[PDB]
Amino acid sequence: GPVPSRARVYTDVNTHRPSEYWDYESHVVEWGNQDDYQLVRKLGRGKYSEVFEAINITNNEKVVVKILKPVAAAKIKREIKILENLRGGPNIITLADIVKDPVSRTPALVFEHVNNTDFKQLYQTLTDYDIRFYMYEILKALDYCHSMGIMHRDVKPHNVMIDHEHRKLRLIDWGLAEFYHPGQEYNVRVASRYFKGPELLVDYQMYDYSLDMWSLGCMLASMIFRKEPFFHGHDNYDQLVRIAKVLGTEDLYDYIDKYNIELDPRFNDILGRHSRKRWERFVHSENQHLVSPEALDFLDKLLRYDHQSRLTAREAMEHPYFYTVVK
Ligand SMILES: CCc1ccccc1-c1ccc(CNCCc2nc3ccccc3[nH]2)cc1C
Numbered sequence: 001g002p003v004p005s006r007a008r009v010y011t012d013v014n015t016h017r018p019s020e021y022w023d024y025e026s027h028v029v030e031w032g033n034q035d036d037y038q039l040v041r042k043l044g045r046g047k048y049s050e051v052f053e054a055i056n057i058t059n060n061e062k063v064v065v066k067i068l069k070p071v072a073a074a075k076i077k078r079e080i081k082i083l084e085n086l087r088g089g090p091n092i093i094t095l096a097d098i099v100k101d102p103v104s105r106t107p108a109l110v111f112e113h114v115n116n117t118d119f120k121q122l123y124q125t126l127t128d129y130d131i132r133f134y135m136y137e138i139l140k141a142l143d144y145c146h147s148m149g150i151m152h153r154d155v156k157p158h159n160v161m162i163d164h165e166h167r168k169l170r171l172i173d174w175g176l177a178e179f180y181h182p183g184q185e186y187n188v189r190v191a192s193r194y195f196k197g198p199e200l201l202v203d204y205q206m207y208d209y210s211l212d213m214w215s216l217g218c219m220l221a222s223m224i225f226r227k228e229p230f231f232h233g234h235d236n237y238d239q240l241v242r243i244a245k246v247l248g249t250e251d252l253y254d255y256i257d258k259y260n261i262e263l264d265p266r267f268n269d270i271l272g273r274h275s276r277k278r279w280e281r282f283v284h285s286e287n288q289h290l291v292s293p294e295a296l297d298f299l300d301k302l303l304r305y306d307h308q309s310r311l312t313a314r315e316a317m318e319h320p321y322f323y324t325v326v327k
Contacts, residue, residue: 002204003258004206006208007208008308029080032099036097040052040054040062043116046158050066050067052065063096064114066111073107075175080098093174111172115163116162135321137169142216143314145171149179150178151180151211152176154176156192156215199307218303240252245274245277247303252271279296
């Protein structure tokens with residue numbers, strides 16, 4: 001059988017909490033009034049959700065309304081519990097209300113307003129300094145949620161909102177997040193394909209917060225190398241192949257050997273044999289302005305097969321890549 005694993009930080013947080021903190025199934029949902037909101041304009045598409053800019057008619061303030069499609073609606077109590085648990089934490093989106101449409105019976109989550117900067121402009125124009133600044137803001141949110149015993153499990157640019165004018169960042173869409181309990185075997189059908197950690201791709205269920213750090217490394221690699229996504233897999237098996245073509249197969253095998261992971265028969269002939277590539281190989285005239293020895297060192301410490309060997313969010317904040325960032 002696979003060798004068990006546990007996080008190297010925040011392992012005990014959920015055992016020292018009352019059952020109501022993590023037992024989301026027991027939570028009773030207090031429904032607000034849907035008549036309190038008037039829909040202004042759409043700016044989101046998501047996966048199983050539609051996002052609108054609205055006005056809360058009781059205080060004339062702008063809000064964000066997330067209407068949930070049936071898939072997301074099924075796990076509402078978990079998303080509500082996590083959002084309520086993290087409310088007020090650094091760079092965490094603020095849940096303001098929970099409403100239900102009496103016509104369609106579909107629920108919605110209402111959040112604080114974020115005046116988002118166009119996502120393409122951000123990808124195309126953020127400087128080296130800005131990337132370090134916002135990567136640091138993302139680490140604040142991840143260290144906070146991990147410290148609160150929660151893994152996001154869907155870290156990707158679509159789930160990070162940035163108001164560049166106010167240098168304001170929020171980590172959003174906690175619909176896939178879960179409470180971390182040591183020894184628990186989780187569903188590996190999480191995150192979005194391009195950001196899935198090797199643990200998910202090889203069906204290693206006993207993962208932890210460190211999955212978020214792999215996804216964060218995928219975002220960083222895409223940004224500094226100007227390749228979106230960085231690991232462009234055609235499907236979940238090919239995803240691992242794309243990863244192995246950069247990180248190499250030797251280390252992949254060492255990882256599966258360390259945890260006694262049984263690989264899927266169809267991987268052995270498709271994984272082939274690949275050497276570990278030097279990060280400097282992805283550096284070109286059009287991306288040299290975003291790359292530094294510190295950025296490559298940092299990236300190297302996130303993009304590791306062994307989930308136990310990746311920097312934690314708190315360790316990542318101490319990295320030299322952030323020394324330039326005004327704190
Ligand atoms: C490579 C991504 C990256 C790497 C390193 C540092 C920053 C980034 C990054 C992160 C996020 C964004 C902007 N993401 C907006 C997505 C979004 N808008 C929404 C509006 C409505 C509903 C849902 C939404 N969801 C941009 C960058 C550059």
